Design a protein around this ligand. Structure first.
Ligand SMILES: [Mg+2]
Ligand SMILES: [Mg+2]
Ligand SMILES: [Mg+2]
Ligand SMILES: [Mg+2]
Ligand SMILES: [Mg+2]
Ligand SMILES: [Mg+2]
Ligand SMILES: [Mg+2]
Ligand SMILES: [Mg+2]
Ligand SMILES: [Mg+2]
Ligand SMILES: [Mg+2]
Ligand SMILES: [Mg+2]
Ligand SMILES: [Mg+2]
Ligand SMILES: [Mg+2]
Ligand SMILES: [Mg+2]
Ligand SMILES: [Mg+2]
Ligand SMILES: [Mg+2]
Ligand SMILES: [Mg+2]
Ligand SMILES: [Mg+2]
Ligand SMILES: [Mg+2]
Ligand SMILES: [Mg+2]
Ligand SMILES: [Mg+2]
Ligand SMILES: [Mg+2]
Ligand SMILES: [Mg+2]
Ligand SMILES: [Mg+2]
Ligand SMILES: [Mg+2]
Ligand SMILES: [Mg+2]
Ligand SMILES: [Mg+2]
Ligand SMILES: [Mg+2]
Ligand SMILES: [Mg+2]
Ligand SMILES: [Mg+2]
Ligand SMILES: [Mg+2]
Ligand SMILES: [Mg+2]
Ligand SMILES: [Mg+2]
Ligand SMILES: [Mg+2]
Ligand SMILES: [Mg+2]
Ligand SMILES: [Mg+2]
Ligand SMILES: [Mg+2]
Ligand SMILES: [Mg+2]
Ligand SMILES: [Mg+2]
Ligand SMILES: [Mg+2]
Ligand SMILES: [Mg+2]
Ligand SMILES: [Mg+2]
Ligand SMILES: [Mg+2]
Ligand SMILES: [Mg+2]
Ligand SMILES: [Mg+2]
Ligand SMILES: [Mg+2]
Ligand SMILES: [Mg+2]
Ligand SMILES: [Mg+2]
Ligand SMILES: [Mg+2]
Ligand SMILES: [Mg+2]
Ligand SMILES: [Mg+2]
Ligand SMILES: [Mg+2]
Ligand SMILES: [Mg+2]
Ligand SMILES: [Mg+2]
Ligand SMILES: [Mg+2]
Ligand SMILES: [Mg+2]
Ligand SMILES: [Mg+2]
Ligand SMILES: [Mg+2]
Ligand SMILES: [Mg+2]
Ligand SMILES: [Mg+2]
Ligand SMILES: [Mg+2]
Ligand SMILES: [Mg+2]
Ligand SMILES: [Mg+2]
Ligand SMILES: [Mg+2]
Ligand SMILES: [Mg+2]
Ligand SMILES: [Mg+2]
Ligand SMILES: [Mg+2]
Ligand SMILES: [Mg+2]
Ligand SMILES: [Mg+2]
Ligand SMILES: [Mg+2]
Ligand SMILES: [Mg+2]
Ligand SMILES: [Mg+2]
Ligand SMILES: [Mg+2]
Ligand SMILES: [Mg+2]
Ligand SMILES: [Mg+2]
Ligand SMILES: [Mg+2]
Ligand SMILES: [Mg+2]
Ligand SMILES: [Mg+2]
Ligand SMILES: [Mg+2]
Ligand SMILES: [Mg+2]
Ligand SMILES: [Mg+2]
Ligand SMILES: [Mg+2]
Ligand SMILES: [Mg+2]
Ligand SMILES: [Mg+2]
Ligand SMILES: [Mg+2]
Ligand SMILES: [Mg+2]
Ligand SMILES: [Mg+2]
Ligand SMILES: [Mg+2]
Ligand SMILES: [Mg+2]
Ligand SMILES: [Mg+2]
Ligand SMILES: [Mg+2]
Ligand SMILES: [Mg+2]
Ligand SMILES: [Mg+2]
Ligand SMILES: [Mg+2]
Ligand SMILES: [Mg+2]
Ligand SMILES: [Mg+2]
Ligand SMILES: [Mg+2]
Ligand SMILES: [Mg+2]
Ligand SMILES: [Mg+2]
Ligand SMILES: [Mg+2]
Ligand SMILES: [Mg+2]
Ligand SMILES: [Mg+2]
Ligand SMILES: [Mg+2]
Ligand SMILES: [Mg+2]
Ligand SMILES: [Mg+2]
Ligand SMILES: [Mg+2]
Ligand SMILES: [Mg+2]
Ligand SMILES: [Mg+2]
Ligand SMILES: [Mg+2]
Ligand SMILES: [Mg+2]
Ligand SMILES: [Mg+2]
Ligand SMILES: [Mg+2]
Ligand SMILES: [Mg+2]
Ligand SMILES: [Mg+2]
Ligand SMILES: [Mg+2]
Ligand SMILES: [Mg+2]
Ligand SMILES: [Mg+2]
Ligand SMILES: [Mg+2]
Ligand SMILES: [Mg+2]
Ligand SMILES: [Mg+2]
Ligand SMILES: [Mg+2]
Ligand SMILES: [Mg+2]
Ligand SMILES: [Mg+2]
Ligand SMILES: [Mg+2]
Ligand SMILES: [Mg+2]
Ligand SMILES: [Mg+2]
Ligand SMILES: [Mg+2]
Ligand SMILES: [Mg+2]
Ligand SMILES: [Mg+2]
Ligand SMILES: [Mg+2]
Ligand SMILES: [Mg+2]
Ligand SMILES: [Mg+2]
Ligand SMILES: [Mg+2]
Ligand SMILES: [Mg+2]
Ligand SMILES: [Mg+2]
Ligand SMILES: [Mg+2]
Ligand SMILES: [Mg+2]
Ligand SMILES: [Mg+2]
Ligand SMILES: [Mg+2]
Ligand SMILES: [Mg+2]
Ligand SMILES: [Mg+2]
Ligand SMILES: [Mg+2]
Ligand SMILES: [Mg+2]
Ligand SMILES: [Mg+2]
Ligand SMILES: [Mg+2]
Ligand SMILES: [Mg+2]
Ligand SMILES: [Mg+2]
Ligand SMILES: [Mg+2]
Ligand SMILES: [Mg+2]
Ligand SMILES: [Mg+2]
Ligand SMILES: [Mg+2]
Ligand SMILES: [Mg+2]
Ligand SMILES: [Mg+2]
Ligand SMILES: [Mg+2]
Ligand SMILES: [Mg+2]
Ligand SMILES: [Mg+2]
Ligand SMILES: [Mg+2]
Ligand SMILES: [Mg+2]
Ligand SMILES: [Mg+2]
Ligand SMILES: [Mg+2]
Ligand SMILES: [Mg+2]
Ligand SMILES: [Mg+2]
Ligand SMILES: [Mg+2]
Ligand SMILES: [Mg+2]
Ligand SMILES: [Mg+2]
Ligand SMILES: [Mg+2]
Ligand SMILES: [Mg+2]
Ligand SMILES: [Mg+2]
Ligand SMILES: [Mg+2]
Ligand SMILES: [Mg+2]
Ligand SMILES: [Mg+2]
Ligand SMILES: [Mg+2]
Ligand SMILES: [Mg+2]
Ligand SMILES: [Mg+2]
Ligand SMILES: [Mg+2]
Ligand SMILES: [Mg+2]
Ligand SMILES: [Mg+2]
Ligand SMILES: [Mg+2]
Ligand SMILES: [Mg+2]
Ligand SMILES: [Mg+2]
Ligand SMILES: [Mg+2]
Ligand SMILES: [Mg+2]
Ligand SMILES: [Mg+2]
Ligand SMILES: [Mg+2]
Ligand SMILES: [Mg+2]
Ligand SMILES: [Mg+2]
Ligand SMILES: [Mg+2]
Ligand SMILES: [Mg+2]
Ligand SMILES: [Mg+2]
Ligand SMILES: [Mg+2]
Ligand SMILES: [Mg+2]
Ligand SMILES: [Mg+2]
Ligand SMILES: [Mg+2]
Ligand SMILES: [Mg+2]
Ligand SMILES: [Mg+2]
Ligand SMILES: [Mg+2]
Ligand SMILES: [Mg+2]
Ligand SMILES: [Mg+2]
Ligand SMILES: [Mg+2]
Ligand SMILES: [Mg+2]
Ligand SMILES: [Mg+2]
Ligand SMILES: [Mg+2]
Ligand SMILES: [Mg+2]
Ligand SMILES: [Mg+2]
Ligand SMILES: [Mg+2]
Ligand SMILES: [Mg+2]
Ligand SMILES: [Mg+2]
Ligand SMILES: [Mg+2]
Ligand SMILES: [Mg+2]
Ligand SMILES: [Mg+2]
Ligand SMILES: [Mg+2]
Ligand SMILES: [Mg+2]
Ligand SMILES: [Mg+2]
Ligand SMILES: [Mg+2]
Ligand SMILES: [Mg+2]
Ligand SMILES: [Mg+2]
Ligand SMILES: [Mg+2]
Ligand SMILES: [Mg+2]
Ligand SMILES: [Mg+2]
Ligand SMILES: [Mg+2]
Ligand SMILES: [Mg+2]
Ligand SMILES: [Mg+2]
Ligand SMILES: [Mg+2]
Ligand SMILES: [Mg+2]
Ligand SMILES: [Mg+2]
Ligand SMILES: [Mg+2]
Ligand SMILES: [Mg+2]
Ligand SMILES: [Mg+2]
Ligand SMILES: [Mg+2]
Ligand SMILES: [Mg+2]
Ligand SMILES: [Mg+2]
Ligand SMILES: [Mg+2]
Ligand SMILES: [Mg+2]
Ligand SMILES: [Mg+2]
Ligand SMILES: [Mg+2]
Ligand SMILES: [Mg+2]
Ligand SMILES: [Mg+2]
Ligand SMILES: [Mg+2]
Ligand SMILES: [Mg+2]
Ligand SMILES: [Mg+2]
Ligand SMILES: [Mg+2]
Ligand SMILES: [Mg+2]
Ligand SMILES: [Mg+2]
Ligand SMILES: [Mg+2]
Ligand SMILES: [Mg+2]
Ligand SMILES: [Mg+2]
Ligand SMILES: [Mg+2]
Ligand SMILES: [Mg+2]
Ligand SMILES: [Mg+2]
Ligand SMILES: [Mg+2]
Ligand SMILES: [Mg+2]
Ligand SMILES: [Mg+2]
Ligand SMILES: [Mg+2]
Ligand SMILES: [Mg+2]
Ligand SMILES: [Mg+2]
Ligand SMILES: [Mg+2]
Ligand SMILES: [Mg+2]
Ligand SMILES: [Mg+2]
Ligand SMILES: [Mg+2]
Ligand SMILES: [Mg+2]
Ligand SMILES: [Mg+2]
Ligand SMILES: [Mg+2]
Ligand SMILES: [Mg+2]
Ligand SMILES: [Mg+2]
Ligand SMILES: [Mg+2]
Ligand SMILES: [Mg+2]
Ligand SMILES: [Mg+2]
Ligand SMILES: [Mg+2]
Ligand SMILES: [Mg+2]
Ligand SMILES: [Mg+2]
Ligand SMILES: [Mg+2]
Ligand SMILES: [Mg+2]
Ligand SMILES: [Mg+2]
Ligand SMILES: [Mg+2]
Ligand SMILES: [Mg+2]
Ligand SMILES: [Mg+2]
Ligand SMILES: [Mg+2]
Ligand SMILES: [Mg+2]
Ligand SMILES: [Mg+2]
Ligand SMILES: [Mg+2]
Ligand SMILES: [Mg+2]
Ligand SMILES: [Mg+2]
Ligand SMILES: [Mg+2]
Ligand SMILES: [Mg+2]
Ligand SMILES: [Mg+2]
Ligand SMILES: [Mg+2]
Lengths: 149, 116, 202, 64
RNA sequence: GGGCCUGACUGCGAGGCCUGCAAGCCGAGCAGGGGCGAAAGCCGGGCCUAGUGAACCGGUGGUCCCGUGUGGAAGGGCCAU
RNA sequence: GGAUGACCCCAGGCGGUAGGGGAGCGUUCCCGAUGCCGAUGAAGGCCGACCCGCGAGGGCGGCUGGAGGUAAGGGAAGUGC
RNA sequence: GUGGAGCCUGGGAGUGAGGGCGCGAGCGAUAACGUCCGCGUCCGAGCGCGGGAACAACCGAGACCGCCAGCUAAGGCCCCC
RNA sequence: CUGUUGGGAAGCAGCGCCAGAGAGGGUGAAAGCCCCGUAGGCGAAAGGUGGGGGGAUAGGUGAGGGUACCCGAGUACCCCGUGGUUCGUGGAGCCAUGGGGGAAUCUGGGCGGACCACCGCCUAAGGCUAAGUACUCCGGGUGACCGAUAGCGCACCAGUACCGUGAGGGAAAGGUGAAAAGAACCCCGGGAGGGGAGUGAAAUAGAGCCUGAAACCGUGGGCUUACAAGCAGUCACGGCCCCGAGGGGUUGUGGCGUGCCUAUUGAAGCAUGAGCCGGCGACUCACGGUCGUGGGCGAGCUUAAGCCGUUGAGGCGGAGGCGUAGGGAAACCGAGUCCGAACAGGGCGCAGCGGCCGCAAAGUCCGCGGCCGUGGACCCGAAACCGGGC
RNA sequence: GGGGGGAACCUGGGGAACUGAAACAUCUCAGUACCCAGAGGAGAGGAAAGAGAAAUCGACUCCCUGAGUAGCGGCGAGCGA
């Protein structure tokens, strides 16, 4: 195979749309913008995601809800990410938070809490928390729940 | 990289100007006036092909008529008669006959008078 | 999988290794495109109407002169003004996925193998830096130079010998790359090189 | 520059698991003495936004 | 017209009217604890269609949800107005 | 029909502003290229009633010109008045 | 009833100055090339074609290209024609 | 090196040769080996530098017990007025400080977001301190950077000419030929200019010089036009002229026929723009986002800065980001959760294809495309506002 | 010893408006433009009366990430560790 035989697949590199380039292009004169108005101008309209022509916006007529919090901001507390038993089936022997960090199941600086979707496998799993059903299933399946603080 | 106009535009104007050869004043000399003249010439052309088919038929008709009234009837009666007879020689050909072959045309006249 | 010729004084033996058999023409393109694009310099520049030398004065009044209204002569509409949306410096580089590069490297070699064009050599006889020495050795291995060769070895003196040739491109094995593979009609690798090519693909 | 979350949206609204947009119902912030218990009770629930106005709001929360 | 009463309910709501949105409207039925009735049943204000104001900011009663090292507190959230 | 753009047969649709979509032409630049066209004449300029293409265009030939030009296939834009 | 029909999910719009005509009303004076609605139509975008002397919207009719062929539509058939 | 063509070899032919050098520029055309270079190497008496190597010098160095001498003052601290911080008076701390009041020296004092206690952290009111970072007047290297309307305002004697009282504004203008061989001399002319001669491969390469387009002006030739009514054309026919059952040019007669663009309900319109020609001139890029698409991997996907290598060679780097679980204001629980007394009722959530292999796919990464957000964001155009100067 | 100059870069002392909020005044533009003073091949900063929950870290500067997060906000436009 040689250099001249290198090709993108059909569809992989598509040509751009060029407006304002003659009658026959189908994009001439107004450059697909229509006639006059704010939208046709360089600069265009206000952020259509929010603005509605001056009347109170949809978003701003809805009521706020709940704690937003105050300066000095967030209150540092321990955080829990759950991982299911089904996610644990791939391992053997012992599973601990750091292992499930490596396997890319649990995110760093998060505390492990085992949840109950899936089956239980007779492992010695070490966490900071278990759900009621995960506790039963895992105790029932010959595994060994181990609690950290 | 920069792509100046360079050679391309001149070649587009020339294409047009050549097409405009023969037109009066700036119409063969200025690129802009040629293009205006050529839009007209193009719609005139298209239309006149259509119109030419009519124009000739109207001449064929006038001609058939003169050679019909030499035998005592009009085009309208003539065309009726040929129609009843089942003679399907077109007006283009009837006309050549009416001038080039007047005996043969007189015969056609005969049949049309018979057919009604 | 693939059967690769190996040159020795003990003869033309054969070597066995597993390079992918079905080769992806789009994937090799995506590697080369990337290789060649990140090498770009991005040093084309132009000046906007604010970067141009003239002043901001309104050349003549808005109304009543009988001329077109203009502001300053930095406007792109003036000959001598700034250019609209011209290039500024640009970085054409981007991070092609590592696994993609790896497959591309595998397939590139595999392609030349399927072609019967891949050749592994044990050593390089008497070539000790002089080009005419390489040419000797070349002949002994079938390299007249009717076919362009990518020579991959860690032996500097071999590279320095073979380098000035029109039909030879030279690489240390850590420099193996698919644009260089595709460019050339024949692949010639020291065993030492083939080992490190092996490490990079597994 | 990377876009900024519209905070007044973040404080009013939520993107559910499938990408619906949910808000508290309007109309019992006050003036409630003459409203029925049915008015009040129903207005305590969340509702789901019409497709068009909901699709606008999700765009203002591009990091949720 | 009279008697007894407070359903001018609490927790919900199948399903629809209307409708660009947001609103507006009608609602059987299950549960809590009641009213009238022997009962069948009716009752989530008024024969009906007007009597009204989204959000922001704050007041007030409750709740005991958060509380910036910790125990409280300050201040906020939630239900009600 | 053949079997998947090989071409053939049959049938229907094909006015069009805003605008949506599809397919192409050309200009500058990069890979192809230590190659290839080029003083037996590069580019550009002036002709042509000739050839190919629906068209944008692409050839070919004569004159001018006197040193550059650049393919198949791909890449990128200061790309068409 | 297989149609450039219909429904569902998404990407891209433009438009948010209409106008004539027919019919049904309000306004005006059983005035306006007047004004405001309803149903329809054409022009808009069919200022391409035939008829109406000439003429966007009245009548005829929806222009893919070519033909020195044929039948009709409105309207015409004394001469212009 | 020889031959051949050519004004000229570097082209073509023949036979060689170098290469750690076949990057590139030149030479009468297109040269590895003719020149300048390139690979690889060598070089400073003098001045500058010297962060590296060496050496000196300043400076640096104990443990208990006692004592309670010292440990940065209009300072800490409190109150008033402000600024800084993400913090706009907010529960408003912290750092700084214009005013007022005004300490202590370790059993002292500041901080951990009002405050208090407990528990920790830290040592205010003196000074200095490389490197890692920023910039580009200057020198060099490299371009999918420009090529004389471009590129800096200036390729040229440009911040010039010119304009302005001044601050300040601010141009135009490159090309003979390989070599001046830049045309002796004669002829017409006052000169300019030309005609010969001459040079040159070429002189419509003659210096008002490469190419030499178009508007525009002229000479010559064919056809045509003075009873004709016109968006200038077109269709038909005939005459004349040219090139050789056909074409080209011209136009007498006949038919038909309301410029282009813009803006509009509607323009030939007596509505806008345009004297004509040439060149310049308007939908882009970065980072996010959202759909679609081409591929890599897949309960996983992917690196950023940096480090190493190359000198158009790629690799490393897992910090972090997205995804794998949701519900709730939150505590919290979790295939559920929220509301509720509820095991009620609801809201928002939860569950591939074929014979272990393949195939597909969540998701994610990169390329490409449409559109959105932030930037001046399709180009041109205000009247104005503010700062510093004149 | 000082004075004065230097394209940008740096610190410090002063410090706008158009514009954005589809009006505008808090807010934005922005401590930007600009003025001034001083530095220097750099400048600033720098050896904890620090961070802030780690029972932890350990001068400062600079890049990546944290993160458009925490928060700030006529809780508007936006601002933003
Ligand atoms: Mg592209
Ligand atoms: Mg397209
Ligand atoms: Mg444009
Ligand atoms: Mg076009
Ligand atoms: Mg289109
Ligand atoms: Mg269109
Ligand atoms: Mg426009
Ligand atoms: Mg648009
Ligand atoms: Mg427009
Ligand atoms: Mg419009
Ligand atoms: Mg317009
Ligand atoms: Mg309009
Ligand atoms: Mg519009
Ligand atoms: Mg307008
Ligand atoms: Mg505009
Ligand atoms: Mg603008
Ligand atoms: Mg605007
Ligand atoms: Mg209003
Ligand atoms: Mg939050
Ligand atoms: Mg803080
Ligand atoms: Mg066990
Ligand atoms: Mg040009
Ligand atoms: Mg141009
Ligand atoms: Mg041109
Ligand atoms: Mg053109
Ligand atoms: Mg041309
Ligand atoms: Mg052309
Ligand atoms: Mg003519
Ligand atoms: Mg003329
Ligand atoms: Mg003329
Ligand atoms: Mg002319
Ligand atoms: Mg026709
Ligand atoms: Mg016609
Ligand atoms: Mg007809
Ligand atoms: Mg008669
Ligand atoms: Mg008949
Ligand atoms: Mg007939
Ligand atoms: Mg580039
Ligand atoms: Mg670039
Ligand atoms: Mg520039
Ligand atoms: Mg520029
Ligand atoms: Mg300026
Ligand atoms: Mg300037
Ligand atoms: Mg200037
Ligand atoms: Mg200036
Ligand atoms: Mg200015
Ligand atoms: Mg000004
Ligand atoms: Mg000025
Ligand atoms: Mg005026
Ligand atoms: Mg004028
Ligand atoms: Mg003028
Ligand atoms: Mg003017
Ligand atoms: Mg002006
Ligand atoms: Mg201007
Ligand atoms: Mg101006
Ligand atoms: Mg200017
Ligand atoms: Mg300007
Ligand atoms: Mg310029
Ligand atoms: Mg200039
Ligand atoms: Mg310039
Ligand atoms: Mg420009
Ligand atoms: Mg621009
Ligand atoms: Mg501009
Ligand atoms: Mg740009
Ligand atoms: Mg850059
Ligand atoms: Mg890009
Ligand atoms: Mg990059
Ligand atoms: Mg090669
Ligand atoms: Mg080579
Ligand atoms: Mg409410
Ligand atoms: Mg309210
Ligand atoms: Mg409330
Ligand atoms: Mg309240
Ligand atoms: Mg009531
Ligand atoms: Mg009630
Ligand atoms: Mg009530
Ligand atoms: Mg309630
Ligand atoms: Mg995030
Ligand atoms: Mg998430
Ligand atoms: Mg009782
Ligand atoms: Mg419902
Ligand atoms: Mg609704
Ligand atoms: Mg209502
Ligand atoms: Mg009861
Ligand atoms: Mg009872
Ligand atoms: Mg009930
Ligand atoms: Mg009543
Ligand atoms: Mg009532
Ligand atoms: Mg109400
Ligand atoms: Mg408000
Ligand atoms: Mg408001
Ligand atoms: Mg409140
Ligand atoms: Mg608590
Ligand atoms: Mg506390
Ligand atoms: Mg206590
Ligand atoms: Mg507590
Ligand atoms: Mg208490
Ligand atoms: Mg409270
Ligand atoms: Mg409280
Ligand atoms: Mg309430
Ligand atoms: Mg057909
Ligand atoms: Mg079709
Ligand atoms: Mg069409
Ligand atoms: Mg299509
Ligand atoms: Mg072009
Ligand atoms: Mg193209
Ligand atoms: Mg160029
Ligand atoms: Mg280039
Ligand atoms: Mg090349
Ligand atoms: Mg070349
Ligand atoms: Mg040749
Ligand atoms: Mg020659
Ligand atoms: Mg020639
Ligand atoms: Mg070319
Ligand atoms: Mg070129
Ligand atoms: Mg051509
Ligand atoms: Mg030529
Ligand atoms: Mg050359
Ligand atoms: Mg090319
Ligand atoms: Mg090509
Ligand atoms: Mg390629
Ligand atoms: Mg341009
Ligand atoms: Mg249709
Ligand atoms: Mg349709
Ligand atoms: Mg269908
Ligand atoms: Mg689009
Ligand atoms: Mg569009
Ligand atoms: Mg719109
Ligand atoms: Mg519109
Ligand atoms: Mg109107
Ligand atoms: Mg309207
Ligand atoms: Mg209307
Ligand atoms: Mg209508
Ligand atoms: Mg009319
Ligand atoms: Mg009638
Ligand atoms: Mg009527
Ligand atoms: Mg009415
Ligand atoms: Mg009357
Ligand atoms: Mg009207
Ligand atoms: Mg009327
Ligand atoms: Mg009327
Ligand atoms: Mg109508
Ligand atoms: Mg219109
Ligand atoms: Mg019509
Ligand atoms: Mg229509
Ligand atoms: Mg007529
Ligand atoms: Mg008509
Ligand atoms: Mg008519
Ligand atoms: Mg019509
Ligand atoms: Mg049709
Ligand atoms: Mg034919
Ligand atoms: Mg008939
Ligand atoms: Mg009739
Ligand atoms: Mg008549
Ligand atoms: Mg007649
Ligand atoms: Mg010779
Ligand atoms: Mg020779
Ligand atoms: Mg040779
Ligand atoms: Mg080299
Ligand atoms: Mg070279
Ligand atoms: Mg060279
Ligand atoms: Mg020469
Ligand atoms: Mg050559
Ligand atoms: Mg060459
Ligand atoms: Mg050379
Ligand atoms: Mg060297
Ligand atoms: Mg050297
Ligand atoms: Mg001691
Ligand atoms: Mg003491
Ligand atoms: Mg101290
Ligand atoms: Mg002191
Ligand atoms: Mg304090
Ligand atoms: Mg204070
Ligand atoms: Mg402040
Ligand atoms: Mg607050
Ligand atoms: Mg504060
Ligand atoms: Mg404190
Ligand atoms: Mg203080
Ligand atoms: Mg003070
Ligand atoms: Mg004390
Ligand atoms: Mg103490
Ligand atoms: Mg303090
Ligand atoms: Mg602290
Ligand atoms: Mg605290
Ligand atoms: Mg501390
Ligand atoms: Mg200091
Ligand atoms: Mg150091
Ligand atoms: Mg320093
Ligand atoms: Mg430094
Ligand atoms: Mg430089
Ligand atoms: Mg060039
Ligand atoms: Mg020039
Ligand atoms: Mg210039
Ligand atoms: Mg030029
Ligand atoms: Mg210069
Ligand atoms: Mg000068
Ligand atoms: Mg003056
Ligand atoms: Mg002066
Ligand atoms: Mg000035
Ligand atoms: Mg100028
Ligand atoms: Mg100049
Ligand atoms: Mg020359
Ligand atoms: Mg010269
Ligand atoms: Mg003389
Ligand atoms: Mg004389
Ligand atoms: Mg003379
Ligand atoms: Mg003379
Ligand atoms: Mg002479
Ligand atoms: Mg001679
Ligand atoms: Mg010659
Ligand atoms: Mg010539
Ligand atoms: Mg010449
Ligand atoms: Mg000249
Ligand atoms: Mg030359
Ligand atoms: Mg010349
Ligand atoms: Mg000339
Ligand atoms: Mg000329
Ligand atoms: Mg003449
Ligand atoms: Mg007469
Ligand atoms: Mg006459
Ligand atoms: Mg007339
Ligand atoms: Mg005729
Ligand atoms: Mg003729
Ligand atoms: Mg002829
Ligand atoms: Mg005529
Ligand atoms: Mg007409
Ligand atoms: Mg007319
Ligand atoms: Mg008309
Ligand atoms: Mg036009
Ligand atoms: Mg136009
Ligand atoms: Mg116009
Ligand atoms: Mg207008
Ligand atoms: Mg108008
Ligand atoms: Mg009007
Ligand atoms: Mg007119
Ligand atoms: Mg006129
Ligand atoms: Mg006017
Ligand atoms: Mg006009
Ligand atoms: Mg106007
Ligand atoms: Mg003028
Ligand atoms: Mg003219
Ligand atoms: Mg022009
Ligand atoms: Mg775009
Ligand atoms: Mg993608
Ligand atoms: Mg991959
Ligand atoms: Mg993120
Ligand atoms: Mg549930
Ligand atoms: Mg459900
Ligand atoms: Mg796959
Ligand atoms: Mg994928
Ligand atoms: Mg995209
Ligand atoms: Mg588009
Ligand atoms: Mg979009
Ligand atoms: Mg901007
Ligand atoms: Mg822009
Ligand atoms: Mg844009
Ligand atoms: Mg302006
Ligand atoms: Mg003024
Ligand atoms: Mg004012
Ligand atoms: Mg003023
Ligand atoms: Mg001033
Ligand atoms: Mg002043
Ligand atoms: Mg000084
Ligand atoms: Mg100084
Ligand atoms: Mg400052
Ligand atoms: Mg000072
Ligand atoms: Mg200040
Ligand atoms: Mg001021
Ligand atoms: Mg302001
Ligand atoms: Mg602005
Ligand atoms: Mg804005
Ligand atoms: Mg404003
Ligand atoms: Mg505004
Ligand atoms: Mg105003
Ligand atoms: Mg303002
Ligand atoms: Mg702004
Ligand atoms: Mg500020
Ligand atoms: Mg400052
Ligand atoms: Mg500045
Ligand atoms: Mg100084
Ligand atoms: Mg430095
Ligand atoms: Mg310092
Ligand atoms: Mg210290
Ligand atoms: Mg994060
Ligand atoms: Mg808010
Ligand atoms: Mg700020």
């Amino acid at each position: 195979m040689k250099l001249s035989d290198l090709r993108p697949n059909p569809g992989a590199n598509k040509r751009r749309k060029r407006v304002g380039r003659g009658p026959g292009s189908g994009h001439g004169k107004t450059a697909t913008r229509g006639h006059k108005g704010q939208k046709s101008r360089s600069g265009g309209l206000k952020d259509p995601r929010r603005f509605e022509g001056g009347r109170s916006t949809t978003l701003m007529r809805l009521p706020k809800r709940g704690m937003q919090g105050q300066v000095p901001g967030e209150i540092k507390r321990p955080r829990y990410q759950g991982v299911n038993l089904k996610d644990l089936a791939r391992f053997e022997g012992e599973v601990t938070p750091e292992l499930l960090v490596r396997a890319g199941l649990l995110k760093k600086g998060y505390r492990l809490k085992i949840l109950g979707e899936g089956e239980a496998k007779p492992l010695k799993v070490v966490a900071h928390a278990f759900s009621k059903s995960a506790l039963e299933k895992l105790k029932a399946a010959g595994g060994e729940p181990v609690l950290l603080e | 990289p920069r792509a100046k106009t360079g050679v391309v535009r001149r070649r587009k104007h020339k294409k047009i100007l050549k097409l405009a050869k023969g037109y009066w004043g700036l119409r063969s000399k200025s690129f802009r006036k040629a293009r205006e003249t050529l839009f007209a010439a193009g719609n005139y052309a298209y239309a006149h092909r259509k119109r030419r088919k009519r124009d000739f038929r109207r001449l064929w008709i006038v001609r058939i008529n003169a050679a019909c009234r030499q035998h005592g009837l009009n085009y309208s009666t003539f065309i009726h008669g040929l129609k009843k007879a089942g003679i399907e020689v077109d007006r283009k050909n009837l006309a050549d006959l009416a001038v080039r072959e007047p005996q043969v045309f007189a015969e056609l006249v005969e049949r049309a008078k018979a057919a009604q | 999988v693939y059967q690769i010729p190996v040159l020795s004084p003990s003869g033309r033996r054969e070597l066995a290794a597993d390079l992918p058999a079905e080769i992806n023409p789009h994937l090799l393109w995506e590697v080369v495109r990337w290789q060649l694009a990140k090498r770009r310099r991005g040093t084309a520049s132009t000046k906007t109407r604010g970067e141009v030398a003239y002043s901001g004065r309104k050349i003549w009044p808005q109304k009543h002169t009988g001329r077109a209204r203009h502001g300053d002569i930095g406007a792109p509409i003036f000959v001598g003004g700034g250019v609209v949306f011209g290039p500024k410096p640009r970085d054409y580089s981007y991070t092609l996925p590592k696994k993609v590069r790896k497959k591309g490297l595998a397939m590139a070699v595999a392609d030349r193998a399927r072609e019967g064009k891949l050749l592994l050599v044990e050593a390089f006889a008497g070539v000790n830096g002089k080009t005419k020495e390489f040419l000797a050795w070349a002949k002994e291995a079938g390299l007249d130079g009717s076919e362009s060769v990518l020579l991959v070895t860690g032996n500097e003196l071999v590279r320095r010998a073979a380098r000035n040739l029109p039909w030879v491109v030279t690489l240390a094995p850590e420099g193996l790359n698919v644009y260089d593979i595709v460019r050339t009609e024949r692949l010639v690798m020291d065993l030492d090189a083939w080992e490190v090519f092996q490490n990079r693909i597994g | 520059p990377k876009m900024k979350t519209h905070k007044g949206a973040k404080k009013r609204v939520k993107i559910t698991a499938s990408g619906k947009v949910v808000a508290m119902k309007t109309g019992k912030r006050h003036l409630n003495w003459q409203k029925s218990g049915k008015e009040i009770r129903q207005k305590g629930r969340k509702f789901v936004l019409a497709k068009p106005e909901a699709e606008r709001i999700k765009l203002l929360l591009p990091y949720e």
